[PDB]
Design a protein around this ligand. Sequence first.
Ligand code: 07D
Ligand code: 07D
Ligand code: 07D
Ligand code: 07D
Ligand SMILES: CC[C@H]1c2cc3[nH]c4c(c3C)C(=O)[C@H](C(=O)OC)c4c3nc(cc4[nH]c(cc(n2)[C@@H]1C)c(C(C)=O)c4C)[C@@H](C)[C@@H]3CCC(=O)OC/C=C(\C)CCC[C@H](C)CCC[C@H](C)CCCC(C)C
Ligand SMILES: CC[C@H]1c2cc3[nH]c4c(c3C)C(=O)[C@H](C(=O)OC)c4c3nc(cc4[nH]c(cc(n2)[C@@H]1C)c(C(C)=O)c4C)[C@@H](C)[C@@H]3CCC(=O)OC/C=C(\C)CCC[C@H](C)CCC[C@H](C)CCCC(C)C
Ligand SMILES: COC1=C(OC)C(=O)C(C/C=C(\C)CC/C=C(\C)CC/C=C(\C)CC/C=C(\C)CC/C=C(\C)CC/C=C(\C)CC/C=C(\C)CC/C=C(\C)CC/C=C(\C)CCC=C(C)C)=C(C)C1=O
Ligand SMILES: COC1=C(OC)C(=O)C(C/C=C(\C)CC/C=C(\C)CC/C=C(\C)CC/C=C(\C)CC/C=C(\C)CC/C=C(\C)CC/C=C(\C)CC/C=C(\C)CC/C=C(\C)CCC=C(C)C)=C(C)C1=O
Ligand SMILES: COC(C)(C)C/C=C/C(C)=C/C=C/C(C)=C/C=C/C(C)=C/C=C/C=C(C)/C=C/C=C(C)/C=C/C=C(C)/C=C/CC(C)(C)OC
Ligand SMILES: COC(C)(C)C/C=C/C(C)=C/C=C/C(C)=C/C=C/C(C)=C/C=C\C=C(C)\C=C\C=C(C)\C=C\C=C(C)\C=C\CC(C)(C)OC
Ligand SMILES: [Fe+3]
Lengths: 44, 44, 44, 44, 44, 44, 255, 45, 45, 45, 45, 45, 45, 45, 259, 274
Amino acid sequence: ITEGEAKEFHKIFTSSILVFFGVAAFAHLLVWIWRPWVPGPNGY
Amino acid sequence: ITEGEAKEFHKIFTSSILVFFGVAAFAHLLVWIWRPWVPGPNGY
Amino acid sequence: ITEGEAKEFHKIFTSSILVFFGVAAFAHLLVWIWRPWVPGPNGY
Amino acid sequence: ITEGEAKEFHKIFTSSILVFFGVAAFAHLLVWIWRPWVPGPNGY
Amino acid sequence: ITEGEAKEFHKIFTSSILVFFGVAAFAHLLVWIWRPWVPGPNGY
Amino acid sequence: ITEGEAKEFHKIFTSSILVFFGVAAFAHLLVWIWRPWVPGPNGY
Amino acid sequence: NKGDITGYMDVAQVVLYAFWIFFAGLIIYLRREDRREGYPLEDAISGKINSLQGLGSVFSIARPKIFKLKTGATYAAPNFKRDAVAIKATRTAPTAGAPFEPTGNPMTDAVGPAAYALRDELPDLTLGGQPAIVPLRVAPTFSVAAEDTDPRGLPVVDRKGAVAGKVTDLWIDRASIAIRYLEVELAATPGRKVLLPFAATRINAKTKSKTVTVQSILARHFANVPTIAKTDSITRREEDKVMAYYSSGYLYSDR
Amino acid sequence: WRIWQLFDPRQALVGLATFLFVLALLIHFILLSTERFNWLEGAST
Amino acid sequence: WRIWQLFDPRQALVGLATFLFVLALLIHFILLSTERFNWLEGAST
Amino acid sequence: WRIWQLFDPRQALVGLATFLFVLALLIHFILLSTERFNWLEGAST
Amino acid sequence: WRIWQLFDPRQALVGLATFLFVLALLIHFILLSTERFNWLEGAST
Amino acid sequence: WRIWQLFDPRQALVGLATFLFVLALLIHFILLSTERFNWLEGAST
Amino acid sequence: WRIWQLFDPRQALVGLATFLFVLALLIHFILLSTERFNWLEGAST
Amino acid sequence: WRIWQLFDPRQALVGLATFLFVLALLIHFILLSTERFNWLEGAST
Amino acid sequence: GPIYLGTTGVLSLVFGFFAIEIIGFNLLASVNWSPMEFGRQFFWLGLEPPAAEYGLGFAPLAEGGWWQIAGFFLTTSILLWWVRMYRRARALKMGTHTAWAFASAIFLFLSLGFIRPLLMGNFSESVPFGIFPHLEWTNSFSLNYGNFFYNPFHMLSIAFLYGSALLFAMHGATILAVSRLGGDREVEQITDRGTAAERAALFWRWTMGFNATMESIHRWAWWFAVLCTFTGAIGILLTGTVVDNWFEWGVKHGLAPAP
Amino acid sequence: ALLSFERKYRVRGGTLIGGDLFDFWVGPFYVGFFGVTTLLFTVLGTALIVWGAALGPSWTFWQISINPPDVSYGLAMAPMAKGGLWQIITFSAIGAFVSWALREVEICRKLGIGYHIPFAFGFAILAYVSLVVIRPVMMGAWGYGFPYGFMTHLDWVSNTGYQYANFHYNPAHMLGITLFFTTCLALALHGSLILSAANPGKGEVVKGPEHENTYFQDTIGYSVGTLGIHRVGLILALSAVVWSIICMILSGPIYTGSWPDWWLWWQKLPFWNH
Ligand code: 07D
Ligand code: 07D
Ligand code: 07D
Ligand code: 07D
Ligand SMILES: CC[C@H]1c2cc3[nH]c4c(c3C)C(=O)[C@H](C(=O)OC)c4c3nc(cc4[nH]c(cc(n2)[C@@H]1C)c(C(C)=O)c4C)[C@@H](C)[C@@H]3CCC(=O)OC/C=C(\C)CCC[C@H](C)CCC[C@H](C)CCCC(C)C
Ligand SMILES: CC[C@H]1c2cc3[nH]c4c(c3C)C(=O)[C@H](C(=O)OC)c4c3nc(cc4[nH]c(cc(n2)[C@@H]1C)c(C(C)=O)c4C)[C@@H](C)[C@@H]3CCC(=O)OC/C=C(\C)CCC[C@H](C)CCC[C@H](C)CCCC(C)C
Ligand SMILES: COC1=C(OC)C(=O)C(C/C=C(\C)CC/C=C(\C)CC/C=C(\C)CC/C=C(\C)CC/C=C(\C)CC/C=C(\C)CC/C=C(\C)CC/C=C(\C)CC/C=C(\C)CCC=C(C)C)=C(C)C1=O
Ligand SMILES: COC1=C(OC)C(=O)C(C/C=C(\C)CC/C=C(\C)CC/C=C(\C)CC/C=C(\C)CC/C=C(\C)CC/C=C(\C)CC/C=C(\C)CC/C=C(\C)CC/C=C(\C)CCC=C(C)C)=C(C)C1=O
Ligand SMILES: COC(C)(C)C/C=C/C(C)=C/C=C/C(C)=C/C=C/C(C)=C/C=C/C=C(C)/C=C/C=C(C)/C=C/C=C(C)/C=C/CC(C)(C)OC
Ligand SMILES: COC(C)(C)C/C=C/C(C)=C/C=C/C(C)=C/C=C/C(C)=C/C=C\C=C(C)\C=C\C=C(C)\C=C\C=C(C)\C=C\CC(C)(C)OC
Ligand SMILES: [Fe+3]
């Protein structure tokens, strides 16, 4: 694998990773509004 | 293996995956109309 | 095999898939008129 | 093994499959006359 | 297998299969006379 | 294994392990606010 | 009184004792078959046929069986062909159980791990009668799998890092498909080629050369590897000699 | 009609016969299992 | 006779006879395993 | 239209037919399992 | 578009089809197992 | 960017995708096992 | 600060990530095994 | 410092890491077994 | 690959395929044709043999008749496979040792399935077709007939099974040890004894006092493997027919103190 | 007495420890320092087993039994009349097995062959140790080791396997059974093929690797090879022993419940849980 190939893989790979993390964060936010998963002192 | 053919493959792959995702979204909308899958705090 | 044979193969494949899907749709229509498969709120 | 033999095969195969399907249809007609297999609303 | 050998084998095969089917049909007729195997509305 | 490329590893490896440890420390701090794991004389 | 034969004997016990008798006979037969090679036992010192045996010596050694080979020759087992009593070693003690000490170079004298059996001076033959083990030059049809690394052209190194030579050919087996020997061109005395067993050579993986490491012997021992008469076939005796010389490295390499 | 140049005639016919017989035997076994269509037992309807 | 140019007569006959014998044996066993059609242990109709 | 250059038409058709047959058999078995859609037994609605 | 030069579009497509079919079958079996979403055996909502 | 110099980008993509899918499947099955987060047969909070 | 001459970088990075992942999975399962730190079930302090 | 020529400076590090990690795991599991030092459950003195 | 079936292979395959189809169809019908329930209970599904009241005759299809048909077809398929492996060895101008070693396993299979039920008069205690059903048949057989641990032929079968494992662990290890001397060419070593065979025999002699040859070790292995199933079949046949309680037999014959 | 080819192999050297002192043969047996230790431990253990038999109630060989100390003793060494004899015999047997393996290593060194044979015997030693040392140690008492008796160890096997309702349902025990049956089947096949090639019938010529491969290809569809079969057999036997060790480690140290009840997870899977 050449240097330019590695750099291209890198930039579009982090470009695809940012979208993946954004989608995961949005889904987890929706799940949190649905039902939070961190119990309180007394519990749920 | 060749750039132009792979590019047109991406074109037809997008044209197919968009249709697939649209069909899946329509089916999921119909299923949500039938019976939603997110219970409330009191349940279903 | 060859390109013209591929033309013919695509033609016959489209015709056969059309007849297959038409028969499937007609069978599903008959089954739906016999007994539908989407339950109501209380059941069937 | 040749296309000229393929003509004759396809002819004989069409004749044989037609005979097979005709026999199957006649047997199915006899079985349906004896006892139908599609139940009414209140079972059989 | 020569053409003549195939034709003669086909002739012998047809004669033998016709004799076999005739014997089977006679046996089935005898068995049906003894005890039929298709139940009526009220069973046997 | 060249010394220069090995040093470049060492540098980026150190940066990445520092990021990993910072994230782990943040998570452990959040869990500590949530529910500490060190009991007192009377327990939890 | 279901299975009772007598007051105490019963059918299960009778069948068990019948099996015991049969198993004793079977052990006798299996030992008979075991004694088809190397027997009768010889005296440790004199070499005369003498051993401590009982009344079962009549049944101990079976009549020689004949193996018919596709080449027309026959091999008898037991063949009663003993090795020479005198060997190039001397016992450390006059006792029968004392070990032997090599007089000179054990690797060349072929004693201990360097010893080999006097097999037939004939190469192994395939179903078609052609020699089984030949170099890849004589067998153009065979080839090494593309997923594997061709040992040809790879340096041959020992356990101490000394380079012994380079692989110039591979010796294959046509009967059972496998690589049997590696033809190595020695660095010292250029033009001299020695055979190298494949089973005693491991590939060193990621060394950027995949050096074919030989843990058996050192680099200086490659010059004394036994030679072969023919350049395209190897006899069974020469095969054994080469494998025996290589197998003795673990014991006589540092001596 | 040129299907037999694609698929070997002998293997095609043999596999078709095996598959058809397997399907027929399975359907007959199912009919024997059911009560209404068990012609050998002959339950009333 | 066209069929016998593709299928070898020996193999075809050997396979057909085996299949027919196995089928006949299975059918006879099935009949023997029924109350109505068991001829060796005949009961009333 | 370019699928028959990319994929082998001889293997693709066999695989598709096997997949469709397996899916149809599975769905029919599930229907036989269900009480409402068991056409052979015919439970009342 | 670059994907298809490194990943063969003959193996990627087959893997995608098999994985998607397996996932769809798994989800459908889960839905059949569950009581609320079992459409073949309709229970109360 | 040198991570792709050390590791094959194709193999890295395949392994990362497989690991992510297996982890997602495991977490989904764990949630289904739990009573609170079982979104199919949902129970009251 | 030159460990990477001794150990192969690829094997080191494919052996240190697996170790960390397995340790994280083990610690998460251990936390699930305790009443206090089980965030899925949920209990009092 | 000559012990690093005596022993492989790679196998030595690997064996030492594997020994220290296993010792740490054993001690931590022993502490988890003990009631006084079980930080997860957290029993009172 | 290049599998030679022949007429005997075709027969055996047809018979075994019919038996497999019958067993699978019965298993699937037991769960009312549910693929989901079939996957759920696949281990627990089984095709039970007929009850004792039917004797050796044909039981009704829903009450063991399918089991009888499937068992007979499977037995015929296995016997035809034995004939096949006899005829292949004869065709290749080789010995029938493989066929005569398979004969011992066939003897045990028939003793479990057909011969012992023939002696006892009914198929009630035959082995059902199913993983957990046949494990439970094993457990219930041992429990009903005293303790199988106390069956001397079960003892011998276990001893020969352990001996088969021990002998293969010895033989494979020895051949790998002498693999650098051409030991894997076993028939070539038998025909012309080499240093590999010599060193293997000498190692075992210096270890445990006695040794075998490159052919006689395979004779040992063959006889151990055959005797395992042969002694086991003898024990199965003698269980219940002549000995109703193996623990009581052992108590009578000194294997255990009297309760 | 020597074989017809033993004198040239009976050479000096190859000892791991002891030097020339023990480099000698007594009859066919190679002695070695580890052989001297093997004789020491064998005589000690056999004499103590006979002593336990004398202390016992019967002289019947089947009913002779040396029992481990009671579970109440824990891991503490017990009095010789209350299981201490069993502990001494256990450790003497362990020493004898280790010395036998090291003697085999010395013989391998002397003959210049591989160590696969002592390596494989190490798995048998490991299984024995797991049964008498590792499992009782992780279980908390020496009383969980099997008694040294012809019948009482079988009674121990029965009781231990019925403590978990049904041992047939132990997942690793199923794999051990599968590999044990496969080892016997493969041994029968290998011996049969080698004997059929070496003895092709009266009046026939000895066959070779071609015929050996062709026979099993024609019959079952594939072959393994000349050395692949031995590697497969060794791996099968060792895997059977390893999975037996795993099932015994799982049964009681890790899992204490009913093995038949352990299988409910399969019926509780989400895609079938109805
Ligand atoms: C009401 C319930 C009822 C009822 C009382 C009753 C009776 C019986 N039925 Mg049935 N059946 C019922 C219903 C019903 N039934 C079928 C049919 C049939 C068929 C067709 C089989 C088939 O397709 O084979 C499909 C097979 C084909 C065409 C090929 C032949 C198969 C072979 C060679 C096997 C392959 C193996 C090899 C080794 C290859 C050889 C090698 C070489 C040549 C080189 C048929 C011969 C047959 C047999 C009987 C029997 C023995 C009984 C018994 C025991 O009572 N049944 C009819 C048909 O012809 O369908 C195409 C049809 O339509 C229909 C209906 C509705
Ligand atoms: C019931 C609701 C629920 C639930 C309790 C839960 C827990 C958490 N999920 Mg989520 N998640 C839930 C549902 C669910 N989830 C996802 C997945 C994924 C991915 C995405 C991949 C990725 O690269 O993420 C990107 C990864 C990142 C963002 C790594 C950053 C990690 C950090 C800064 C440290 C984490 C620790 C804390 C903040 C401690 C604070 C706790 C307290 C105060 C009490 C992934 C690793 C991940 C992380 C986590 C995290 C940090 C949490 C915490 C601590 O809340 N979750 C799975 C997936 O896509 O796998 C490929 C998937 O399918 C699936 C499902 C069903
Ligand atoms: C409560 C349970 C229990 C118990 C406590 C206990 C104890 C132990 N025992 Mg025992 N046993 C118990 C019961 C019990 N015991 C067995 C037998 C044995 C064997 C099997 C040998 C073999 O190779 O079988 C295996 C060989 C067979 C069964 C025959 C080979 C089969 C062939 C050729 C057929 C070919 C197949 C096809 C073409 C595929 C057809 C397809 C379909 C059906 C779908 C053996 C050596 C053995 C081992 C152990 C040990 C080591 C122990 C330990 C450590 O506890 N036991 C008996 C027998 O006679 O074995 C020959 C027998 O039948 C029987 C019973 C009921
Ligand atoms: C409820 C009763 C029950 C039950 C229903 C059931 C069923 C079956 N099970 Mg099981 N089993 C039950 C009980 C139970 N099960 C066993 C074990 C197993 C194994 C291990 C075999 C092995 O690898 O031995 C490995 C052997 C060892 C221990 C090797 C040690 C030997 C050494 C170092 C050498 C010693 C040398 C000398 C002393 C010197 C000699 C001197 C001279 C001759 C001069 C295994 C594969 C196996 C066989 C079967 C089968 C085939 C069946 C059938 C037919 O159903 N079972 C476990 C074990 O020992 O695991 C290591 C164990 O303890 C235990 C229990 C409690
Ligand atoms: C010495 C005792 C050991 C032993 C030995 C042994 N077993 C043996 C042999 C030997 C020596 C063989 O030679 C023989 C063999 O071939 O081994 C590879 C065998 C064998 N023992 C086997 C297994 C086996 N061995 C076992 C154990 C043992 N056998 C003992 C440990 C065990 C157990 C329970 O432990 C099992 C399960 C088989 C693998 C094999 C015998 C194969 C056999 O008999 O097959 C019969 C044929 C069939 C079932 C046909 C199946 C057909 C399929 C449905 C395919 C489709 C065909 C086609 C489509 C049909 C036509 C359709 C049309 C009619 C529509
Ligand atoms: C690991 C794979 C298989 C295996 C392999 C294996 N065994 C081996 C070897 C190998 C490769 C040898 O090289 C070695 C050998 O030389 O065999 C001839 C051996 C051997 N394994 C043996 C037996 C054996 N192997 C067994 C099993 C197995 N070993 C596995 C199945 C079994 C069982 C139960 O299945 C037994 C009984 C011997 C033939 C031999 C061990 C020789 C030895 O240890 O010699 C030194 C010891 C003595 C001469 C006697 C010691 C006596 C003690 C002082 C008392 C021990 C008492 C004991 C604890 C209880 C006795 C009562 C029992 C009834 C419970
Ligand atoms: C390539 O094909 C291969 C072959 O090859 C061609 C083969 O062959 C084989 C091998 C396989 C076979 C031969 C088939 C048979 C094998 C089996 C069926 C496996 C089962 C094996 C057995 C049942 C046999 C078990 C017998 C054993 C374990 C031997 C027992 C030995 C001893 C107890 C003593 C060991 C010897 C020692 C330590 C020294 C010698 C001891 C004496 C002679 C007696 C005592 C001596 C004295 C008193 C004097 C010296 C005393 C001293 C030094 C002081 C000691 C002080 C005390 C008093 C204690 C294989 C595998 C192979 O694949
Ligand atoms: C000198 O050296 C010698 C050779 O060399 C020259 C040799 O060669 C051999 C011969 C030895 C071998 C070829 C292998 C030996 C190794 C073993 C025994 C362990 C491995 C076990 C197996 C793979 C079993 C092999 C047994 C077979 C193939 C018997 C063939 C029987 C039939 C064709 C009859 C019909 C088949 C039936 C009914 C089942 C047969 C059993 C299997 C095919 C395996 C079981 C499979 C299932 C039931 C479900 C799994 C389905 C599969 C595998 C397909 C889907 C894919 C999956 C992965 C699930 C020897 C002995 C030898 O001495
Ligand atoms: C060579 O390159 C060329 C020139 C050809 C250019 C071409 C480039 C192309 C086409 C590139 C393609 C790029 C793509 C499609 C990239 C996609 C990247 C993605 C989606 C990356 C995602 C990465 C995710 C990561 C790293 C996530 C890791 C998460 C971990 C390790 C989480 C662990 C969580 C644990 C252990 C939690 C456990 C909790 C429980 C309770 C489950 O434990 C028991
Ligand atoms: C395509 O279709 C598929 C392949 C999907 C169908 C699926 C098939 C499946 C899943 C098949 C296998 C299922 C299972 C789980 C099989 C497991 C079988 C096991 C483990 C069996 C174990 C032991 C059984 C034994 C030992 C039984 C032996 C029985 C014998 C020998 C019976 C003989 C009976 C005779 C000779 C009967 C005589 C009486 C006659 C018929 C002569 O007169 C009354
Ligand atoms: Fe020999």
